């Protein structure tokens, strides 16, 4: 499982951790993340996120 960035504000998502405060829990992977969940830092929608490639 892959992290994603918030292209916005730079926060990580980390499958490893999930979400648990806004219901997504670890082991979540990003594309099973519900459509409607928005970065926890500043707000923005799935659609400005990346993969991380490394
Ligand atoms: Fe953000």
Redesign the pocket.
């Known amino acids: 499982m892959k992290k994603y960035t918030?292209t916005?504000?730079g926060?990580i998502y980390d499958p490893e951790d999930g979400d648990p405060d806004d219901g997504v829990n670890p082991g979540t992977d990003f594309k099973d993340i519900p459509d409607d969940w928005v970065?926890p830092?500043?707000g923005?929608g799935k659609d400005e996120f990346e993969e991380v490639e490394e």
């Open positions: 918030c916005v504000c926060y970065c830092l500043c923005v």
